[PDB]
């Protein structure tokens, strides 16, 4: 179902509408131009930013799902219509760990990274960092596995040493980690994304709750139960087979229009939790943004947010000359980073109460931006055409037109204008409000 080049295309009317629980699917050419390498240009540097793949529910959530499925089964006198599978369903999901399907998504990602940048990757060993989370590090290892599988099959590859994960960045309230958030005190106390997501759930779920209970005489459901049954559709699909070849029976319980609501619920939680809807959301992406400026311009980092000044000034942990960089982060920090880079500056603040599509929001949704296995590529290229370098940004293969600089028809800016137009992050935005 899952392809190396295009990601997951099984039951796309449903599987592309699970927000950050959607398996990655390519958005090449959706509301965008081709992602192909322009004629007469050569990539000179690529940064990849990736999430982990599909996983089991967290321990917390696995207990809540198992307690709900168990309670329905305990209490119902009849399992009616599309809910009748619950008669025999056995809750079998594990917790926390990547699923086999999620591991393969990351092997695929590495193969796809090699194939897309083959002319560069042939002679280069990427510099790789991972935020210190087992799922993230495991994803980094699978991406390396796929990259090497591809490289050692290419007779034009000249430097075939495998890359190591060189930097594991601790995750805590006191470690400055640009790939995870933790040190911005006031932001860690924020409840806004939760409050927005709960308000929206309380608006859309009641009608589904009422219809669902009536298919299960003896059962009482809540709004949160609706959300848990919808969550079950993605989690059971990405666990129940090693290739996610079978849509879970939970999925049919809900209509296509209801799936659009659930997708929106996830987009709202990310937008108001971590993106521009949170007053300190984009501030969590300034540290990586300044790290990216340093790499693209081969110049030392200027940052006073969540960089570590020690780690950024040593070539062992932050080389400025490496041609390929790959960093493994998290969905929530990746949303902050994309906002901090200005990439969704055509997105108006999302309606807290009513569905707006990814295309209405100029390419923003949780499923188009941080699906399981999400990746972004930030390229510099040197053209026979042009001659300052040019920069381009791809998020899950969609060319996302840059803001803060005048973009050409291929969505590129001159590198110097790009970095100058990142004035908000270069200034440290409103980081001082953290304290
Ligand atoms: C910065 O990195 C150094 C060297 O790893 C570490 O000892 C120090 O605790 C880090 N400080 C912060 C605040 O991240
Ligand atoms: C949640 O809805 C209440 C009830 O109308 C409203 O007062 C509140 O401002 C909403 N909260 C958020 C964060 O939008
Ligand atoms: C860590 O972050 C806090 C700034 O947000 C800062 O005061 C401190 O200097 C930074 N420490 C290091 C080692 O970068
Ligand atoms: C995005 O818009 C914000 C809010 O107007 C602005 O502060 C920021 O500089 C913009 N970012 C870019 C890269 O243009």
Coordinates of C-alpha atoms and ligand atoms in Angstrom, one line a residue:
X1 CA 0.0 0.0 0.0
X2 CA 2.8 2.2 1.1
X3 CA 5.2 3.2 -1.7
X4 CA 8.7 4.6 -1.5
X5 CA 7.9 7.4 -3.7
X6 CA 4.4 8.4 -2.9
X7 CA 3.8 7.0 0.6
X8 CA 0.5 5.5 1.7
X9 CA -2.2 5.2 -0.9
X10 CA -4.6 2.6 0.4
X11 CA -8.2 3.9 1.1
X12 CA -6.9 7.5 0.7
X13 CA -10.4 9.0 1.2
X14 CA -10.1 7.8 4.8
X15 CA -6.4 7.3 5.5
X16 CA -5.4 10.8 4.4
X17 CA -7.8 12.3 7.0
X18 CA -6.3 11.0 10.3
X19 CA -4.2 14.2 11.0
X20 CA -0.8 13.3 12.6
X21 CA -2.0 9.6 12.7
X22 CA -2.2 9.5 8.8
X23 CA 0.7 7.6 7.3
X24 CA 2.8 9.9 5.1
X25 CA 1.4 10.5 1.6
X26 CA 3.0 12.6 -1.1
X27 CA 1.6 16.1 -1.7
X28 CA 3.7 16.6 -4.8
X29 CA 1.8 19.1 -7.0
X30 CA -1.1 19.7 -4.6
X31 CA -1.6 23.4 -4.6
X32 CA 2.0 23.6 -5.7
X33 CA 4.5 23.3 -8.7
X34 CA 6.6 20.2 -9.5
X35 CA 9.1 19.1 -7.0
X36 CA 11.6 18.0 -9.8
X37 CA 15.2 19.4 -9.9
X38 CA 15.1 22.4 -12.2
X39 CA 17.0 22.0 -15.5
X40 CA 20.5 23.5 -15.2
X41 CA 20.7 23.4 -11.4
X42 CA 22.5 21.2 -9.0
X43 CA 21.7 20.7 -5.4
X44 CA 24.5 21.8 -3.2
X45 CA 23.1 21.2 0.3
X46 CA 20.0 19.4 1.6
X47 CA 18.6 19.4 5.2
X48 CA 16.0 16.8 6.0
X49 CA 13.7 17.1 9.1
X50 CA 11.8 13.9 9.9
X51 CA 9.3 12.5 12.5
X52 CA 9.1 8.9 13.6
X53 CA 6.9 6.4 11.8
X54 CA 3.6 4.8 12.7
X55 CA 3.4 3.5 16.3
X56 CA 1.1 1.8 18.8
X57 CA -0.9 4.2 21.1
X58 CA 1.1 5.6 24.0
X59 CA 0.7 3.6 27.3
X60 CA -1.8 6.2 28.6
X61 CA -3.9 6.0 25.4
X62 CA -3.6 2.2 25.0
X63 CA -5.2 1.8 28.4
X64 CA -8.0 4.3 27.6
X65 CA -8.8 2.5 24.3
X66 CA -8.6 -0.9 25.8
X67 CA -10.8 0.1 28.7
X68 CA -13.4 1.6 26.2
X69 CA -13.4 -1.4 23.8
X70 CA -13.7 -3.7 26.8
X71 CA -16.6 -1.7 28.3
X72 CA -18.6 -1.8 25.1
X73 CA -18.0 -5.5 24.9
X74 CA -19.0 -6.0 28.6
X75 CA -22.2 -3.9 28.4
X76 CA -23.8 -4.2 24.9
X77 CA -26.8 -6.5 24.5
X78 CA -26.3 -6.4 20.8
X79 CA -23.6 -5.2 18.5
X80 CA -25.7 -3.6 15.6
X81 CA -24.8 -3.1 11.9
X82 CA -21.3 -1.7 11.3
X83 CA -20.5 -2.1 15.0
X84 CA -21.1 -5.9 15.0
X85 CA -17.4 -6.7 14.6
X86 CA -17.1 -5.6 18.2
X87 CA -18.7 -8.9 19.1
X88 CA -15.4 -10.7 18.3
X89 CA -12.8 -7.9 18.2
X90 CA -9.9 -8.6 20.5
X91 CA -7.8 -5.6 21.6
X92 CA -4.4 -6.6 20.9
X93 CA -2.3 -3.4 20.4
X94 CA 0.9 -2.8 22.3
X95 CA 2.1 0.5 23.5
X96 CA 4.5 3.2 22.6
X97 CA 6.7 1.3 20.2
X98 CA 7.0 1.8 16.4
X99 CA 4.9 -0.9 14.5
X100 CA 6.5 -2.9 11.8
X101 CA 4.7 -0.8 9.3
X102 CA 6.2 2.4 10.9
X103 CA 9.6 0.9 10.8
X104 CA 9.3 0.2 7.1
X105 CA 8.0 3.8 6.4
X106 CA 11.3 5.1 7.7
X107 CA 13.4 2.6 5.7
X108 CA 11.4 3.9 2.7
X109 CA 12.1 7.4 3.6
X110 CA 15.9 6.8 3.6
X111 CA 15.7 5.0 0.2
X112 CA 13.6 7.9 -1.2
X113 CA 16.1 10.5 0.2
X114 CA 19.0 8.7 -1.5
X115 CA 17.1 8.3 -4.8
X116 CA 16.0 12.0 -4.9
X117 CA 19.4 13.4 -4.1
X118 CA 21.5 10.6 -5.7
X119 CA 23.9 12.8 -7.5
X120 CA 24.9 14.4 -4.2
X121 CA 24.4 11.4 -1.9
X122 CA 26.8 9.3 -4.0
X123 CA 29.8 11.0 -2.5
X124 CA 28.4 12.2 0.8
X125 CA 27.8 10.7 4.3
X126 CA 25.1 12.8 5.9
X127 CA 25.5 14.4 9.4
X128 CA 22.6 13.0 11.5
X129 CA 21.1 14.0 14.9
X130 CA 18.2 12.6 16.9
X131 CA 16.1 14.0 19.7
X132 CA 16.6 11.6 22.7
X133 CA 13.4 9.5 22.4
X134 CA 13.6 5.7 21.7
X135 CA 11.0 5.9 18.9
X136 CA 12.9 8.8 17.2
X137 CA 16.3 7.2 17.5
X138 CA 14.8 3.9 16.2
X139 CA 13.4 5.8 13.2
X140 CA 16.8 7.4 12.5
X141 CA 18.3 3.9 12.4
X142 CA 15.7 2.6 10.0
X143 CA 16.2 5.7 7.8
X144 CA 19.9 5.0 7.8
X145 CA 19.1 1.3 6.9
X146 CA 17.1 2.4 3.8
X147 CA 19.7 5.0 2.8
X148 CA 22.5 2.5 2.8
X149 CA 20.4 -0.1 1.1
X150 CA 19.9 2.3 -1.7
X151 CA 23.5 3.6 -1.8
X152 CA 25.1 0.2 -1.9
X153 CA 22.9 -0.8 -4.9
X154 CA 24.1 2.3 -6.9
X155 CA 27.3 1.6 -8.9
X156 CA 28.0 5.3 -9.0
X157 CA 28.3 5.7 -5.2
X158 CA 31.9 6.6 -4.3
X159 CA 31.8 7.0 -0.6
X160 CA 29.8 4.2 1.0
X161 CA 30.7 4.5 4.7
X162 CA 27.5 4.3 6.7
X163 CA 26.5 7.4 8.8
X164 CA 26.2 7.2 12.5
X165 CA 23.7 9.1 14.6
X166 CA 26.3 11.6 15.8
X167 CA 24.2 13.6 18.4
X168 CA 21.5 12.4 20.7
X169 CA 19.8 15.5 22.1
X170 CA 18.4 15.1 25.6
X171 CA 14.7 15.8 26.2
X172 CA 14.1 17.6 29.5
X173 CA 13.0 20.9 31.0
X174 CA 16.6 22.0 31.3
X175 CA 18.3 20.8 28.1
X176 CA 18.3 23.3 25.3
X177 CA 17.1 21.0 22.4
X178 CA 16.0 22.6 19.1
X179 CA 14.4 19.3 18.0
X180 CA 12.0 19.1 21.0
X181 CA 10.4 21.8 23.2
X182 CA 10.9 21.9 27.0
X183 CA 12.7 24.9 28.3
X184 CA 10.1 27.7 27.5
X185 CA 8.3 27.7 30.9
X186 CA 5.3 29.7 30.1
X187 CA 4.7 27.7 26.9
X188 CA 4.9 24.3 28.8
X189 CA 2.1 25.6 31.1
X190 CA -0.1 26.5 28.1
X191 CA -3.5 24.6 27.9
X192 CA -4.7 26.5 24.7
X193 CA -4.4 23.7 22.2
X194 CA -6.2 21.3 24.6
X195 CA -9.0 23.8 25.3
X196 CA -9.5 24.5 21.5
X197 CA -9.5 20.8 20.7
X198 CA -11.9 20.0 23.6
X199 CA -14.3 22.8 22.5
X200 CA -14.3 21.4 19.0
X201 CA -14.8 17.9 20.1
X202 CA -17.8 19.1 22.3
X203 CA -19.3 20.6 19.1
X204 CA -18.9 17.7 16.7
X205 CA -19.0 14.5 18.7
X206 CA -22.5 14.6 20.3
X207 CA -24.5 13.7 17.2
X208 CA -22.1 10.8 16.6
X209 CA -22.2 9.7 20.2
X210 CA -26.0 9.5 20.1
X211 CA -26.0 7.4 16.8
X212 CA -23.2 5.2 17.9
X213 CA -24.9 4.3 21.3
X214 CA -28.0 3.3 19.6
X215 CA -26.0 0.6 17.6
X216 CA -24.9 -0.7 21.0
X217 CA -28.0 -1.0 23.3
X218 CA -26.8 -1.2 26.9
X219 CA -23.9 1.1 26.2
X220 CA -23.4 4.8 27.2
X221 CA -20.8 6.7 25.3
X222 CA -19.2 10.1 25.7
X223 CA -17.7 12.6 23.3
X224 CA -14.3 11.4 24.3
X225 CA -15.3 7.9 23.5
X226 CA -16.2 9.0 19.9
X227 CA -12.7 10.4 19.5
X228 CA -11.2 7.2 20.9
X229 CA -13.1 5.0 18.4
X230 CA -12.0 7.3 15.6
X231 CA -8.3 7.1 16.9
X232 CA -8.7 3.3 16.8
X233 CA -9.2 3.4 13.0
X234 CA -5.6 4.6 12.4
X235 CA -3.9 2.8 15.2
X236 CA -5.6 -0.6 14.5
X237 CA -4.9 -0.1 10.7
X238 CA -1.1 0.5 11.2
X239 CA -0.7 -2.4 13.7
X240 CA -3.0 -5.1 12.4
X241 CA -0.8 -6.1 9.5
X242 CA 2.9 -5.5 9.0
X243 CA 2.2 -3.5 5.8
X244 CA -1.0 -1.7 6.8
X245 CA -2.8 -3.5 4.0
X246 CA -6.2 -3.9 5.8
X247 CA -8.3 -0.9 6.8
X248 CA -9.5 -1.4 10.4
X249 CA -13.2 -2.2 10.9
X250 CA -13.3 0.9 13.2
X251 CA -12.9 3.1 10.1
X252 CA -16.4 2.3 8.5
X253 CA -18.1 3.4 11.7
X254 CA -17.8 7.0 10.6
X255 CA -18.7 8.8 7.4
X256 CA -16.3 10.7 5.1
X257 CA -17.6 14.0 6.3
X258 CA -17.0 12.9 9.9
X259 CA -13.5 11.9 8.9
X260 CA -13.0 15.5 7.7
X261 CA -14.0 16.7 11.2
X262 CA -11.6 14.4 13.0
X263 CA -8.8 15.5 10.6
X264 CA -9.7 19.1 11.5
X265 CA -9.7 18.3 15.2
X266 CA -6.1 17.2 14.8
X267 CA -5.2 20.2 12.7
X268 CA -6.6 22.5 15.4
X269 CA -4.7 20.8 18.2
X270 CA -1.4 21.3 16.4
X271 CA -2.2 24.9 15.2
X272 CA -3.3 26.1 18.7
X273 CA -0.8 23.9 20.6
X274 CA 2.3 24.5 18.5
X275 CA 1.6 26.6 15.5
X276 CA 0.7 30.3 15.0
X277 CA -2.5 29.9 17.0
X278 CA -0.4 29.6 20.2
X279 CA 1.2 32.9 21.3
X280 CA 4.4 31.0 22.1
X281 CA 4.1 28.1 19.5
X282 CA 6.3 29.4 16.7
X283 CA 8.9 30.5 19.3
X284 CA 9.6 26.7 19.9
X285 CA 10.8 26.6 16.3
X286 CA 13.2 29.5 16.4
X287 CA 16.3 27.5 17.6
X288 CA 16.1 25.0 14.7
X289 CA 15.4 27.8 12.3
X290 CA 18.6 29.6 13.4
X291 CA 20.5 26.3 13.1
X292 CA 19.1 26.0 9.5
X293 CA 20.2 29.5 8.7
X294 CA 23.7 28.6 9.9
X295 CA 23.9 25.5 7.8
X296 CA 22.5 27.1 4.6
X297 CA 24.9 30.0 4.8
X298 CA 27.9 28.0 6.2
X299 CA 28.1 30.5 9.1
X300 CA 28.0 30.2 12.9
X301 CA 24.7 30.1 14.6
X302 CA 23.2 33.3 16.0
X303 CA 20.5 32.2 18.5
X304 CA 19.5 32.8 22.1
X305 CA 16.4 30.5 22.4
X306 CA 16.7 26.7 22.5
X307 CA 20.1 26.2 20.9
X308 CA 22.9 24.9 23.1
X309 CA 25.9 27.4 22.7
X310 CA 28.4 24.6 23.4
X311 CA 27.0 22.1 21.0
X312 CA 26.7 24.6 18.1
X313 CA 30.3 25.8 18.2
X314 CA 32.0 22.4 17.8
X315 CA 32.3 20.6 14.4
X316 CA 31.7 17.3 16.1
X317 CA 28.2 18.2 17.1
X318 CA 27.4 21.0 14.6
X319 CA 29.6 21.0 11.5
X320 CA 28.9 24.0 9.2
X321 CA 30.3 22.5 6.0
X322 CA 28.5 19.0 5.6
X323 CA 26.3 19.0 2.4
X324 CA 23.7 16.7 3.8
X325 CA 22.1 17.0 7.2
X326 CA 19.3 14.7 8.6
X327 CA 17.6 15.5 11.9
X328 CA 15.0 13.4 13.6
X329 CA 12.5 15.4 15.7
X330 CA 8.8 15.3 16.7
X331 CA 5.5 16.3 15.2
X332 CA 4.8 19.1 17.6
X333 CA 8.3 20.7 17.3
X334 CA 8.1 20.3 13.5
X335 CA 4.9 22.3 13.4
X336 CA 6.6 25.1 15.5
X337 CA 9.6 25.1 13.2
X338 CA 7.5 25.3 10.0
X339 CA 5.6 28.3 11.5
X340 CA 8.8 29.9 12.7
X341 CA 10.2 29.6 9.1
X342 CA 7.2 31.5 7.8
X343 CA 6.1 28.6 5.6
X344 CA 2.4 28.8 6.5
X345 CA 2.2 32.6 6.5
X346 CA -0.6 32.3 3.8
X347 CA -2.7 30.4 6.4
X348 CA -5.3 32.4 8.1
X349 CA -6.0 31.6 11.8
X350 CA -8.0 28.5 11.9
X351 CA -11.7 28.6 12.8
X352 CA -12.0 27.2 16.3
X353 CA -15.5 25.9 15.6
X354 CA -15.9 25.1 11.9
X355 CA -13.9 22.9 9.4
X356 CA -11.6 24.5 6.9
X357 CA -9.8 22.3 4.4
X358 CA -6.1 22.0 3.9
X359 CA -6.5 23.8 0.5
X360 CA -8.6 26.6 2.1
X361 CA -5.7 27.0 4.6
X362 CA -3.1 27.1 1.9
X363 CA -1.7 23.7 2.5
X364 CA -1.9 23.5 6.2
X365 CA -3.4 20.4 8.0
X366 CA -1.9 17.9 10.4
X367 CA -2.1 15.2 7.8
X368 CA -0.4 17.3 5.1
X369 CA 2.3 18.6 7.5
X370 CA 3.1 16.0 10.2
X371 CA 1.7 12.6 9.2
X372 CA 3.5 9.5 10.7
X373 CA 6.8 9.5 8.8
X374 CA 6.6 13.2 7.9
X375 CA 9.7 14.7 6.3
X376 CA 10.7 18.1 5.1
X377 CA 13.6 18.9 2.7
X378 CA 15.2 22.2 2.6
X379 CA 17.5 22.6 -0.4
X380 CA 20.1 24.9 -1.7
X381 CA 20.9 24.7 -5.4
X382 CA 23.4 26.4 -7.7
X383 CA 22.1 27.0 -11.1
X384 CA 23.9 27.7 -14.4
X385 CA 20.7 29.8 -14.8
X386 CA 21.0 32.1 -11.5
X387 CA 24.2 32.4 -9.2
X388 CA 23.7 33.3 -5.7
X389 CA 22.4 30.0 -4.5
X390 CA 18.7 29.5 -4.4
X391 CA 16.7 27.8 -1.6
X392 CA 13.5 25.6 -1.9
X393 CA 11.4 23.9 0.8
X394 CA 9.5 20.7 0.4
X395 CA 7.1 19.4 3.1
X396 CA 6.0 15.8 2.3
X397 CA 7.0 16.5 -1.3
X398 CA 4.9 19.6 -1.7
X399 CA 6.9 22.7 -2.8
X400 CA 5.9 25.2 -0.1
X401 CA 6.4 28.7 -1.4
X402 CA 8.7 30.7 1.0
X403 CA 7.6 33.8 2.7
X404 CA 9.5 36.9 3.7
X405 CA 11.4 36.9 0.3
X406 CA 10.2 37.2 -3.3
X407 CA 9.7 33.7 -4.6
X408 CA 10.2 32.7 -8.2
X409 CA 7.7 30.6 -10.2
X410 CA 9.4 27.4 -8.9
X411 CA 8.9 28.6 -5.3
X412 CA 12.6 29.5 -4.6
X413 CA 14.2 32.6 -3.2
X414 CA 17.8 33.8 -3.3
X415 CA 19.5 32.4 -0.3
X416 CA 20.6 35.8 1.0
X417 CA 17.0 37.2 0.7
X418 CA 15.6 34.1 2.4
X419 CA 17.8 34.4 5.4
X420 CA 17.2 38.2 5.7
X421 CA 13.4 37.5 5.4
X422 CA 13.6 35.2 8.5
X423 CA 13.9 38.4 10.6
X424 CA 11.3 37.2 13.2
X425 CA 13.4 34.1 14.1
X426 CA 16.7 35.9 13.7
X427 CA 15.3 38.3 16.4
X428 CA 14.3 35.6 18.8
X429 CA 10.6 36.5 18.3
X430 CA 8.8 36.6 21.7
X431 CA 11.1 34.1 23.5
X432 CA 11.5 36.4 26.4
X433 CA 7.7 35.8 27.3
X434 CA 8.6 32.3 28.1
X435 CA 9.9 33.6 31.4
Ligands
LIG1 C1 24.7 22.3 26.6 O1 25.5 21.2 26.1 C2 26.5 20.8 27.2 C3 27.5 19.8 26.6 O2 26.7 18.7 26.3 C4 25.7 20.3 28.4 O3 26.7 19.9 29.4 C5 24.9 21.4 28.9 O4 24.1 21.0 30.1 C6 23.9 21.9 27.8 N1 23.2 23.0 28.4 C7 21.9 23.3 28.1 C8 21.2 24.3 28.9 O5 21.3 22.7 27.2
LIG2 C1 -14.2 27.2 24.7 O1 -15.5 27.5 24.6 C2 -16.1 28.4 25.6 C3 -17.6 28.1 25.6 O2 -18.1 29.0 24.7 C4 -15.5 29.8 25.3 O3 -15.8 30.7 26.3 C5 -14.0 29.6 25.3 O4 -13.4 30.9 25.0 C6 -13.5 28.5 24.4 N1 -12.0 28.3 24.6 C7 -11.1 28.4 23.6 C8 -9.7 28.3 24.1 O5 -11.4 28.8 22.5
LIG3 C1 19.9 27.6 27.2 O1 18.7 28.3 27.0 C2 18.6 29.5 27.9 C3 18.0 30.5 27.0 O2 16.8 30.3 26.5 C4 19.8 30.4 28.0 O3 19.6 31.4 29.0 C5 21.1 29.6 28.1 O4 22.2 30.5 28.0 C6 21.2 28.5 27.1 N1 22.3 27.7 27.6 C7 23.1 27.2 26.6 C8 24.2 26.3 27.1 O5 23.0 27.4 25.4
LIG4 C1 5.2 35.5 9.1 O1 4.2 36.5 9.5 C2 4.6 36.9 10.8 C3 3.3 37.6 11.4 O2 2.9 38.7 10.5 C4 5.8 37.8 10.7 O3 6.1 38.2 12.0 C5 7.0 37.0 10.2 O4 8.1 37.7 10.0 C6 6.6 36.2 8.9 N1 7.7 35.3 8.5 C7 8.3 35.3 7.3 C8 9.4 34.3 7.0 O5 8.0 36.2 6.4

